[model samples]
Target chain A: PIVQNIQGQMVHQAISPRTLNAWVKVVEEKAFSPEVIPMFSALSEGATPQDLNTMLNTVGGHQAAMQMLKETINEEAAEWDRVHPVHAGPIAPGQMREPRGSDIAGTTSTLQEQIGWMTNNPPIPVGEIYKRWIILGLNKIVRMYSPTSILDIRQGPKEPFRDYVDRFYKTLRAEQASQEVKNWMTETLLVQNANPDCKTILKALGPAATLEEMMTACQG
Target chain B: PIVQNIQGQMVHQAISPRTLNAWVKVVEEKAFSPEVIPMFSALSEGATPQDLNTMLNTVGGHQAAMQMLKETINEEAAEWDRVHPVHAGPIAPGQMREPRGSDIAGTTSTLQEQIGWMTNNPPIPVGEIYKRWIILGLNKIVRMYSPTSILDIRQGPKEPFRDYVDRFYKTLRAEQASQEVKNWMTETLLVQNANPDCKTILKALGPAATLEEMMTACQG
Candidate 1:
């Protein structure tokens, strides 16, 4: 029910629930292609021009478009628009739905907060980044502060400390590796033809053996 | 100028060859799908329908339907003949061109002779139909006389005449191999690995094993 307010403003107070459904039925009856039907199906189902095009193209093994048929529809729409200029207004304005800022904030908050907390409490020790330590035998301490520039290189922990033994061992091996040994490890050991372990042992032996002789020594 | 004898046969003829070509054009222009165009074209090029059908079915992909679609044409032809019966004498009692048995024999002889030659000498030998004997060892040898029945108790060739040398050697080694030996071959000895010598070993094995294993053993 619409009523005239004190200032003569028209106000819609209430609408019968069944009124909208009744109007939808009336609109659907008047419309050539019902809104409920899919656009592709409405334009093509039951042997329409578009359907014929699809069938012909399928049989001919080439895709075809009903360009001439679509052009006729466009011409009909234009004629209808010419008779009523106001009808063009709804067509002219490009409407787009905007998402609410709060929706974006709500969606991302859980992940964003977790990432924020993780950035501060990193996985690697702060001291380890600057200095490496080796415990000496009885009452002596040995510290090797890496001469290279220390940067904040901490990342979130991938595995528990107990499960990271392999990574720890590998880092230790890499650090302790000499330049010549590293080169031999890369070139001879990792090479397509070379046996990696035999090459590794030869590199560790340092400039005194062939690969075949190294294998024989290992066997002995 | 098809001069008819009293027996309604052409004793000495000079009929317009253009008329025969016109009849051919009429048949060729019939509303048959272009997918069977090759068959119709071959028919026009002096191949009989049976000859064209056999070749298309045996060799052509599903896209070509010379054999399958001919059944429809044949049904239609049979229906037409049933509707309009014709009197039959040596030259159909009264016909324009007296087609003799010799004319048909000449036209069909070439196809029959070609088919006969093909059955005798196919591209792939009929004995070695499915298995690629040059690579895969003979699991069973089909008897030439029977052409269908398989021979029992077939065995792989011995070493030197082996299917593929390196693989054969590896197989022998593998059968006699302990877990440690197999691991060494895979990891340390690296025989089964991609080594150049593997190919030579496979060839040396002959038709006994896969060439890949031979190459691998050679590499080791």
Candidate 2:
């Protein structure tokens, strides 16, 4: 959620073109490969300076969004929750409602009942069910999905500081996919409509300091 | 290709469902991890008895073809002189016509003239020329936009071993992908697609012997 918030903020601010270009150059250096080098050289061989600028600008704009996003998620932990508090609280008279005793007890009872149901089941079936429950729990625990709250948020204003680096990477990997797919699209319009932008969009839209400012500005 | 051919033949033969089940069980027991066990299961699962039969028959047929091809190539190599003997006696019907003296000298001069041209001219721009050459070579080598030669054969018999292997793995991956997409299509599909049948299909089609077969087939 924090990562999403940061992404949203990035989209709001549009960051800076110069900043984006610098970031793009850094990432491009990392992702560039020998195979791609020759290919790109060929494509750009006869390209005019203006065309090259356009290409770099396109890449930089996207890159700026990415770096902005990365910083928001990777570094901006405290500011996220200050802006997007889980409970808005009694800010206004009509908006506030106290928690009910019955509600609390009912929630507790449901959890206990589920546990009882699991325990009473036959060993074989229960074993399988338990395995699945654990797997599901582990999957959640592993934070295998990216831009995840656990990974992206360093520390909410009130939350504890915990290690979530692996979780964030996993979420990034799990999101969309491990690879890009363009060959299977059946129609040109579908391809055209496809959101070829990812990291760029993610950077702009996620909840981070810059995004929070954007949101605040919009609300103000 | 050989591997895919073999697998296709196996699928075509369609061993008893019981045998397939047993094979799956054995492989699963041998390697229970997600990486290995699921592969065998995927290949054998949901394979309509008919689909299995078709795959087996195809693989076996391709193997037979490979064997024949190998024998033919070997025989040709052994009888090279007889099959392509140099002119011995006077030329006979169907023999290639010899060049006249003028034609022979003209061809030699043409080759020499080309060499002379190269010797006189400045060296081709190595980097640019090399890139162009490679791009052209790659286009020809991969036949990127063309229907593959295997598909163009006069007889519909069987796809080339290499092509068959490539397509087979593609199918397997697609099957796995279909399962994943089915899962994410809806919450219900995710659970339904996670069923043993879906698991088996994913195993077979995703990373099993299919991948290995593809690699082997492409070696040629």
Candidate 3:
């Protein structure tokens, strides 16, 4: 409500208790934490209390809020990059590194940059953008860090049979290969293992046998 | 010339020397042999010298005569079939017989019967009919007499290498195989020969090498 001050100034007080409670309800429904409320309010500055209420009441309002949050996160990521530049380079042969979910974070940033400039773009829902980001980001990560070809995978000259097989399976799983590709890799590895009876056993397994089944047969 | 016989009936007399010579010229130009002249005359009964000249002057007159000759040959073939019926059957296992061209003669008789009925069908030109007869007749003969499959050409367990090779060539030639098929047959025979060095020698002869070259290599 507006109140008159002694100097003939109109002083604006806090919104009615009812409106405040309703705003809190909208924030809660959107799954926004108390900590993020201040930031959301700051981003939506100049919007009247009634305007905010209307925006929150509309369908897919949560999605719009999600897009706003993504934008905020992107801006924060940019600031972070400015402070400490990300150092990404070609991974060296035989180098070992711990697996991190954010290993593809830099690639996702680049993807966001490309997606930012789409021409006459229709508004993609927050969920759709998230899905695209994940698919593209992971594909980039795979292209960059994973074995790009069959020849890129190697069993050590004197590597133990079990050790080689374990590495082979791990590499195959990382590639997210189809059944056909997995079977081919299994047969190729088995042949290269120099087992004289490998072909006869593979033939007995038939064409549709899995890698695990093939490995078991080899062990037998 | 037209003349009155003793009984007062108008009879056609022998043609003049000039007309006879002209008729001889037409026969020679048409490539008709003297031996078949009387037969041609008998077939074109009641046709005078002038009428014969008129028939020969038209386009495709010789083709009509050729058709007549083919009919004659067909009749002779039918008579031949009646005198000595061709004996064709599935060759028995481990049974050998001398190669006889007439082994498929019965099949040819059937083919000829089909061709004979196709006559008076105007769309089939004389040459086209001849070509169809030859292709269909020979194919039928091949189907009847040739080894139905590659397995049918196997050598006896104790057969000499040269004797087996000889029989193989005879059978392959009778089948009228292309070079590719002949090469395959050669390789198959060499593999069955159980000579450890056969492949090495055949490979040295190269892909375009003939059966004779392969045989020479085997002998060496």
Candidate RMSDs in Å, in order, are 34.2, 31.2, 40.8
Provide interface RMSD per model, one decimal: 31.1, 23.8, 54.7
The A-chain TM-scores of all the candidates are 0.14, 0.16, 0.32
Cα RMSD for candidate 1? 34.2
Q: Per-candidate DockQ versus the true complex?
A: 0.01, 0.01, 0.00
Task: Output the lDDT of residue A122, model 3.
Answer: 51
The whole-model C-alpha lDDT of candidate 2 against the native structure comes to 0.30
- Per-residue CA lDDT of model 3 for B15-120, tens digit only, reads 2323333443455464433223443343334323222333232212233232223333354446545775645777555433212222222223322232222222
Interface RMSD of 2: 23.8
For residues A74-102, what per-residue lDDT tens digits would candidate 2 score against the true structure? 22223433443455445444332222222
Please tell me how candidate 3 rates in CAPRI terms.
incorrect
Interface RMSD, candidate 1? 31.1
**lDDT of each prediction vs. the true structure?**
0.29, 0.30, 0.41
Report residue A40 deviation for candidate 2 (angstroms). Answer: 12
Winner of 2 and 3 under lDDT: 3
- How big is the positional error of residue A110 in model 3, measured in Å on the Cα after superposition? 20
Off by over 4 Å in 3: A1-124, A152-160, A176-206, B1-220
